[PDB]
C-alpha cells in the first residue's frame, strides 16, 4: 500500500515537483539561456585582421584613424573644398579605413573573378571572416554542411559598383548578387552550406548588435543550434562621408572623441567584426571553446525623438535596463560598460545621462565607461560587434582598454556623481568572486537602440589533465592553393615561433580538428619543435623536406590494397608492437587465432629479427609454413591500424595471400576464420 | 495529519500541479502562442491600395 496514500500522493508530489523543476529550467533556457562566444573574427580599422592583433591596438592605446583609402579609386579631389556646403565634398580628413577590403580571394570559394569583382566588399569580407570565425573555433568550416547554423550579418545598402540600370561590361549578371544586403547572409550560408536562418539585418550604427540579439533569440528558442552573428560596414565609395558632412556631423579629423570636450563630430570608420554564437549548454557539451558569454540583449527604438537622427534619452535607458532584466543582471552587476560613444557633441551627453540613469543611479563601484570607436572610429553597422570584441578581449586579458581622446571629460556631462569612471587609463580587470560582466551599447542613426550584457566565460575550463605520449600526431595543414599552402606553413611557423611552448599534440589536434581538408595538403609527423619549424620553414618555400605534399582535388576515400610476399626482412612489426598498444593487442588476437591451427605464436618469432633468423639453417622468413601465418598476422594487424586511426578501405585488393586479409578486415570472415 | 493520511501533502501536490500547468502553458505561450493578424495594409500592383 502507501501508508494510506501517504506514499502514493508523495510519490506523485515527487514527480509534479521534478517535472516543475524541469519545466521551469526549460523556461529559463527559453528566455535566459546564456549564449557563448565560440570564436571571434574581425577586420577593424588599421592593421587589425585577427582578434589578437586587435588587443595589440587597445592595450597600447593606438588610434586607427590614419586617413582616407587610396586603393578604392576614390576621387579624393572633389572630396575636400573650402566651402563646407559644396555638393560632393566630405568634411572628415581621415578616419580608420581598411587597407585589405579592396582585395579578396575569389578562387578560394566557389566564386569566379568576374563574380567576385561585382561582390560588395561588405559581402566579400564576410566570406573570409566566416572562414576565420570557424577555424578559430576549432570547427572545420566544411564540417557544417546542411546543419542548422543561422547567419545574422548587418550591413548598410551603400553603393559599390555602377548603376544596375546601366549594367556593366564584364560584370552584368553578378552586379545583383554583389550590391544586395540580402545575399550578404545567404552567400555565407551557401559557401559554407549552412542551412540555418540567413538574416541580413539593417539597423544603421547598431546593425551588428541588433543582429546578435536576433541570433541570441535563435539559440534560446532553439531554431539554430549554432548562431553566426556580426556586422560590417566596408566603405567602397566616398559618398557616405560626403553626405553625413551635409548634416555637419562628421569630425573633421575623423576621430571619435567619445565623451570629450573636443568632440567636433562623430567621425567615421570602416571595419568588420564577426562572432560565433552558441548556447552555453551546446557550446560546452560539444567541446567548443567558450571565450565569453552573452547573457541578455535588448533592442528598442528611440521613438519620436528630436528627429530621426537625434538620439533619445528615456528610450536609451529603457534598452540598457531591459537587457539587464532580460539577462537577469543589473546596474551593480556590470563592472564596465562599452557604450556607443559615437563622438558627436550631442549624442554623447544624452548617451552618458542614460548610462548615469540605468547604471549610475545605483552603483557600488564606479562604472568603467569605454568606447571602441575612440581607438577605431565609428564603424557604423560594424559597431556593436566591435564593442563586444573589445569587452571579451578585455575579459580574456584581465585589463580594461583605454578610451583615446578622453582625457578632457565632456563638460556637458555631470560626472560629479562618480558612479561612472571614464576609461582614460588601463584599469585592471582581474577575475574574482564577482563574475565579470560588461555591457555593449549601439544607438543607430535609424533610431533603433540596442544593448547587450557580456558575462565572463564561467571558469569551468580549469581542471584539464596532463600526460605525455609517444604518438607523433601528424601536423596536417591544407589550403586551396599552392601559394596558400606555402603561406599556411609560414604563418603557423611564425605562430609557433612567436607563441612558443605549445605542446605538439595540442597543435596537431587543432590543425587536424579545426582546419578544413582543403585541396592542397601538406602533412608531416614532427618529433620536436625544431624538426617541425624546420619542415614549416621548407614548406613555406615549397621544399618538401620531412613532409608529404599533394594536390588531391575530388578525393576522399581510401582503398586498402594487400601486397603479398616481398618484405622478407620482417623486422618492422617489433617496433610497431612496442610503441602501439593496439599493435600489442590486435596482433595478439590474430596470433591467438593462428595458434589453435598453427602452433607457432608470432610474438616469440617476431622479436627474432632477420639478424637472429639465419642461424638454425634458416633465412629471412622463407619457411612457407612459418612465413605465411606471420605475414598474415602482421598483415591483418596493419589493416586494423589504419582503421583504428580512422581510415576505412573503400575496396579490398589481395595480391596472393591478401585474399585472406580480405576475409578478415572486410568482415567476410572472422579473425579465427581467416587465421585458420 | 487528521483525516485518513493526506490533507497537507495533497495541498502541496495540488500547488505543484497548478505550478506545472502555469509553467508549461508559459512554454506554449513563449514558443507556440498564436499570433493574431490585427490588420493588413497593402500597396499592390493593379491599383490595389
Amino acid at each position, epitope marked *: 500500500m502507501a501508508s494510506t496514500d*501517504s*506514499e502514493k500522493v*508523495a510519490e506523485y*508530489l*515527487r514527480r509534479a*515537483t521534478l517535472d*516543475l*523543476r524541469a519545466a*521551469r529550467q526549460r523556461i*529559463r533556457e527559453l528566455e535566459g539561456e546564456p549564449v557563448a562566444v565560440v570564436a571571434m573574427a574581425c577586420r577593424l580599422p588599421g592593421g587589425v585582421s585577427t582578434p589578437e592583433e586587435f588587443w595589440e591596438l587597445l592595450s597600447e592605446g593606438r588610434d586607427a584613424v590614419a586617413g582616407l583609402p587610396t586603393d578604392r579609386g576614390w576621387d579624393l579631389d572633389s572630396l575636400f573644398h573650402p566651402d563646407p556646403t559644396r555638393s560632393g565634398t566630405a568634411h572628415q580628413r581621415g578616419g580608420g579605413f581598411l587597407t585589405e577590403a579592396t582585395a579578396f580571394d575569389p578562387a578560394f570559394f566557389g566564386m569566379s573573378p568576374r563574380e567576385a569583382l561585382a561582390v560588395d566588399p561588405q559581402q566579400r569580407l564576410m566570406l573570409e571572416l566566416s572562414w576565420e570565425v570557424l577555424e578559430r573555433a576549432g570547427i572545420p568550416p566544411t564540417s557544417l554542411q546542411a546543419s542548422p547554423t543561422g547567419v545574422f550579418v548587418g550591413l548598410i545598402p551603400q553603393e559599390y559598383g555602377p548603376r544596375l540600370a546601366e549594367g556593366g561590361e564584364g560584370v552584368e549578371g553578378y552586379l545583383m548578387t554583389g550590391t544586395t544586403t540580402s545575399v550578404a547572409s545567404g552567400r555565407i550560408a551557401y559557401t559554407l552550406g549552412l542551412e540555418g536562418p540567413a538574416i541580413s539585418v539593417d539597423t544603421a550604427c547598431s546593425s551588428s548588435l541588433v543582429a546578435v540579439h536576433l541570433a541570441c533569440q535563435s539559440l534560446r528558442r532553439g531554431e539554430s543550434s549554432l548562431a553566426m552573428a556580426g556586422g560590417v560596414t566596408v566603405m567602397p565609395t566616398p559618398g557616405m562621408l560626403v553626405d553625413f558632412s551635409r548634416m555637419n556631423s562628421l569630425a573633421p579629423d575623423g576621430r571619435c572623441k567619445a565623451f570629450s570636450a573636443g568632440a567636433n563630430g562623430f567621425g567615421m570608420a570602416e571595419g568588420a567584426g564577426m562572432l560565433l554564437l552558441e548556447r552555453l549548454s551546446d557550446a560546452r557539451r560539444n567541446g567548443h571553446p567558450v571565450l565569453a558569454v552573452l547573457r541578455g540583449t535588448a533592442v528598442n527604438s528611440d521613438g519620436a525623438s528630436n528627429g530621426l537622427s537625434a538620439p533619445n534619452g528615456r528610450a536609451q535607458v529603457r534598452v540598457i535596463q531591459q537587457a539587464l532584466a532580460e539577462s*537577469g543582471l*543589473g*546596474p*551593480a*552587476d556590470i563592472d564596465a560598460v562599452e557604450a556607443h560613444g559615437t563622438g558627436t557633441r550631442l549624442g554623447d551627453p544624452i548617451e552618458a545621462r542614460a548610462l548615469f540613469e540605468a547604471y549610475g543611479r*545605483d552603483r*557600488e563601484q564606479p562604472l568603467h565607461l569605454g568606447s571602441v570607436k575612440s581607438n577605431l572610429g565609428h564603424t557604423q553597422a560594424a559597431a556593436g560587434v566591435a564593442g563586444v570584441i573589445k569587452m571579451v578581449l578585455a575579459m580574456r586579458a584581465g585589463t580594461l582598454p583605454r578610451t583615446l581622446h578622453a582625457s578632457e571629460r565632456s563638460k556637458e556631462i555631470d560626472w560629479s556623481s562618480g558612479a561612472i569612471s571614464l576609461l582614460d587609463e588601463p584599469e585592471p580587470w582581474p577575475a574574482g568572486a564577482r563574475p565579470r560582466r560588461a555591457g555593449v551599447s549601439s544607438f543607430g542613426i535609424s533610431g533603433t537602440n540596442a544593448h547587450a550584457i557580456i558575462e565572463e566565460a564561467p571558469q569551468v575550463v580549469e581542471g584539464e589533465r596532463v600526460e605525455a605520449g609517444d604518438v607523433v600526431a601528424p601536423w596536417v595543414l591544407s589550403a586551396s592553393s599552392a601559394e596558400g599552402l606555402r603561406a599556411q606553413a609560414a604563418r603557423l611557423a611564425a605562430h609557433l615561433r612567436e607563441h612558443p611552448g605549445q605542446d605538439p599534440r595540442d597543435i596537431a589536434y587543432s590543425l587536424a580538428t579545426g582546419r578544413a581538408a582543403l585541396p592542397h595538403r601538406a602533412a608531416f609527423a614532427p618529433v620536436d619543435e625544431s624538426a617541425a619549424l624546420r619542415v614549416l620553414d621548407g614548406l613555406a618555400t615549397g621544399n618538401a623536406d620531412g613532409a608529404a605534399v599533394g594536390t588531391s582535388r575530388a578525393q576522399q576515400r581510401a582503398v586498402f590494397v594487400f601486397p603479398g610476399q616481398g618484405w622478407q626482412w620482417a623486422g618492422m612489426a617489433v617496433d610497431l608492437l612496442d610503441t602501439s598498444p593496439v599493435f600489442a593487442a590486435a596482433l595478439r588476437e590474430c596470433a591467438d587465432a593462428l595458434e589453435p591451427h598453427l602452433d607457432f605464436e608470432v610474438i616469440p618469432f617476431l622479436r627474432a629479427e632477420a639478424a637472429r633468423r639465419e642461424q638454425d639453417a634458416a633465412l629471412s622468413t622463407e619457411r612457407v609454413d612459418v612465413v605465411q601465418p606471420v605475414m598474415f598476422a602482421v598483415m591483418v594487424s596493419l589493416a586494423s591500424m589504419w582503421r583504428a586511426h580512422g581510415v576505412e578501405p573503400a575496396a579490398v585488393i589481395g595480391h596472393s595471400q591478401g585474399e585472406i586479409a580480405a576475409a578478415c578486415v572486410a568482415g567476410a570472415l572472422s579473425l579465427d576464420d581467416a587465421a585458420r | *495529519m*487528521a*483525516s*485518513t493520511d493526506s*490533507e*497537507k*501533502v495533497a*495541498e*502541496y501536490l*495540488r*500547488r*505543484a500541479t*497548478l*505550478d506545472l500547468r*502555469a*509553467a508549461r502553458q508559459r512554454i506554449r505561450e513563449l514558443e507556440g502562442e498564436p499570433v493574431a493578424v490585427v490588420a493588413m495594409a497593402c500597396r499592390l500592383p493593379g491599383g490595389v491600395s
Partner: antibody, heavy 118, light 114 residues
Framework: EVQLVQSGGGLVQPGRSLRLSCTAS????????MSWVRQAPGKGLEWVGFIRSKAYGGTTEYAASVKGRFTISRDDSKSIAYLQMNSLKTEDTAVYYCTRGGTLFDYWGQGTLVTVSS | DVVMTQSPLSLPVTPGEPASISCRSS???????????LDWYLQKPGQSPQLLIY???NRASGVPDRFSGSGSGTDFTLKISRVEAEDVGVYYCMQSLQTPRLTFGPGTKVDIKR
C-alpha cells in the same frame, strides 16, 4: 483566473455577531480547504481556523483562542466560505484574511478590517 | 512539543544587492517523504501576504524567480537573489508540519538598507 474577494467589515461592540464571507471564483470550491487568518494591526499574524473539504469531510479546526466562539462552513453550489463571529471581544479588532488551504495558504484575500471597539 | 521556528528577524537589504534569510527549526522538518515542510510567506505592507516558496525549495507560480530557496534538515535558507524598491516587507518562516498553524512567527522586518 482566481479571486478570493471578501466582504463583511463593520464596527461592533464586544459581545455581538458579525458576518464574514469569502467569495470563490475561478476554481473548484470543494477541492481546497478554506482557512481564515487574523492580522493584528501593525504586528504579528494569528491564525483562526479552517474547514476541510467535503470530499475529505473531516472536521472544523480552530485556534485555541476561539473555541466555542467562531464557526466555519462551506458550500459548492453557491461557492461562499463562511467565518461566523459570535460573542466578539476586544482582541477581534483586526483585519481578517481568507486563505486557500489548511496548511498551504497559497492565496490570500485582500483583508476586511474587522473592528470591535467600545 | 512545538518546533521553534526563528529567522534573523531583521534584514536591512538595499536595492540591487543579494541577501539571504535563514531560519531555526528546533525539530527536524525533513519529513520521511524527502521533502521539507516549511513555507515562505511575504506580507506586503498594506496588502495581503503572498506564497513565495513551499516545501522548503519549490517556488510558487506568479512570484518572480528572485525568491530562490533551499535548506538542510533543520537549517533553511531563502536565497533572495536580489531586492528592488518593491522587495520590502515582512517574511514569515512558517513550518507546515504539525497543524494547527496558529503562530505565523514574529516576522522579519525587511528594510531598505542604508
Amino acid at each position: 483566473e482566481v479571486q478570493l474577494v471578501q466582504s463583511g467589515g463593520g464596527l461592533v461592540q464586544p459581545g455581538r455577531s458579525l458576518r464574514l464571507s469569502c467569495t470563490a471564483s475561478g476554481f473548484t470550491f470543494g477541492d481546497y480547504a478554506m482557512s481564515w487568518v487574523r492580522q493584528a494591526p501593525g504586528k504579528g499574524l494569528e491564525w483562526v481556523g479552517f474547514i476541510r473539504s467535503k470530499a475529505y469531510g473531516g472536521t472544523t479546526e480552530y485556534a485555541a483562542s476561539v473555541k466555542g466562539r467562531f464557526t466555519i462552513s462551506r458550500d459548492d453550489s453557491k461557492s461562499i466560505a463562511y467565518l461566523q463571529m459570535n460573542s466578539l471581544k476586544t482582541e477581534d479588532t483586526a483585519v481578517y484574511y481568507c486563505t486557500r488551504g489548511g496548511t498551504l495558504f497559497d492565496y490570500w484575500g485582500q483583508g476586511t478590517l474587522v473592528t470591535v471597539s467600545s | 512539543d512545538v518546533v521553534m521556528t526563528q529567522s534573523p528577524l531583521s534584514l536591512p537589504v538595499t536595492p540591487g544587492e543579494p541577501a539571504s534569510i535563514s531560519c531555526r527549526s528546533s525539530q527536524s522538518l525533513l519529513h520521511s517523504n524527502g521533502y521539507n515542510y516549511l513555507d515562505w510567506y511575504l506580507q506586503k505592507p498594506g496588502q495581503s501576504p503572498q506564497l513565495l516558496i513551499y516545501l522548503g525549495s519549490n517556488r510558487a507560480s506568479g512570484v518572480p524567480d528572485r525568491f530562490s530557496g533551499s535548506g538542510s534538515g533543520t537549517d533553511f535558507t531563502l536565497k533572495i537573489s536580489r531586492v528592488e524598491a518593491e522587495d520590502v516587507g515582512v517574511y514569515y518562516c512558517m513550518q507546515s508540519l504539525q497543524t494547527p498553524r496558529l503562530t505565523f512567527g514574529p516576522g522579519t522586518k525587511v528594510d531598505i538598507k542604508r
